[PDB]
Design a protein around this nucleic acid. Structure first.
Ligand code: CL
Length: 346
RNA sequence: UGUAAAUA
């Protein structure tokens, strides 16, 4: 029987097994649940750097078979850790040709993410040179988008310009990514980490189809990131569009969160625009803030208004809603809605 | 009373 069957049989019988004992059994050990845990434990606990190197040639030689294995991917990742710098370059060479497909695989993509998290900028750039070949499809992928997000978090902005240029490759690409469950996460990282010269055309593209993206189940989060990471003029264009169309935005499922984001991140003069729209007379109807309090989504928006505005801005909300309180108690959940506001009407 | 993610 081979070393692994023997070691799996009685684990404690070989409490004195060492990494240099594995030798040619590394592949079988790494693809085995018990074997892989042994290798990992030894790599993390051994103080012998020559033990740790004794298995590295077999890791490199079997790299393609290990990176997308349920148990072997951990073994490969061990050699991208801080403490194995001396191995990083050799290990990138071992996987580089197949990075374009590793990015889509559920185990291998965790190797790529660990590499980008740990390795120096020349090696990151090398990995991204392969990602560049599959970048559009990669951004829309459950696995590939995690690789792209890590690249944006960990590489200097100038070396992800190719990703920004993919978001800008065609008129509708930013829309297509913003409404994709995976592509929307890439747009968000870009907004968080890219330079102002990179984010400005991206935000400009989002603005052109703003109403659709704001009410999309994924796009509303993209718009929320524009509010938080865009410029003052961006917030102003957004607050201005939201104020002018306050009832439409507040009474839809996803765009209602966009208004809440404006209230949390907004300057006093943005809040004042939203409050003024909310309290405007409307000669032939009740004020918009009252209609919103009757609505399944907008009542949370009104609650957020009261919680976020100045005392003087609360004054106008209180003076506008209080006449209509009796009617509002009747409506569905109207009891609870006004209860959560009682502290402002006491 | 209302929204999001790939490993043993
Ligand atoms: Cl998969």
């Amino acid at each position: 029987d081979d070393l692994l069957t023997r070691y799996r049989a009685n684990p404690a019988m070989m409490k004195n097994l060492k990494l240099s004992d594995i030798r040619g059994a590394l592949l079988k050990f790494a693809k085995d649940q018990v074997g892989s845990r042994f290798i990992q434990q030894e790599l993390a606990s051994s103080k012998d750097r020559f033990e740790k190197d004794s298995i590295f040639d077999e890791v490199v030689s079997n790299a393609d078979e290990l990176v997308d294995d349920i148990f072997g991917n951990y073994v490969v990742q061990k050699f991208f850790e801080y403490g194995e710098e001396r191995h990083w370059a050799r290990l990138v060479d071992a996987i580089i040709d197949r990075v374009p497909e590793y990015a889509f695989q559920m185990y291998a993509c965790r190797v790529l993410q660990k590499a980008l998290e740990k390795i120096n900028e020349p090696l990151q750039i090398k990995i991204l040179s392969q990602i560049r070949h599959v970048i559009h499809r990669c951004m829309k992928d459950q696995n590939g988008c995690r690789v792209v997000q890590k690249a944006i978090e960990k590489v200097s902005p100038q070396y992800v310009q190719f990703i920004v240029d993919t978001l800008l490759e065609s008129s509708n690409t930013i829309y297509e990514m913003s409404v994709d469950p995976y592509g929307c996460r890439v747009v968000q990282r870009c907004l968080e980490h890219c330079s102002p010269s990179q984010t400005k055309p991206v935000i400009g593209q989002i603005h052109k189809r703003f109403d659709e993206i704001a009410n999309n189940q994924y796009g509303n989060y993209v718009v929320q990131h524009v509010i938080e990471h865009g410029s003052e003029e961006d917030r102003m264009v957004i607050v201005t569009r939201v104020s002018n169309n306050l009832f439409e935005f507040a009474t839809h499922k996803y765009s209602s969160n966009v208004i809440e984001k404006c209230l949390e991140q907004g300057a006093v003069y943005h809040k004042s625009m939203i409050v003024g729209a909310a309290c405007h007379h409307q000669e032939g109807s009740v004020p918009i803030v009252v209609q919103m309090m009757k609505d399944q989504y907008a009542n949370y928006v009104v609650q957020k208004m009261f919680d976020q505005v100045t005392s003087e801005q609360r004054r106008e909300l209180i003076l506008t809603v209080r006449p209509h309180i009796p009617v509002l108690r009747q409506f569905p959940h109207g009891k609870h809605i006004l209860a959560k506001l009682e502290k402002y009407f006491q």
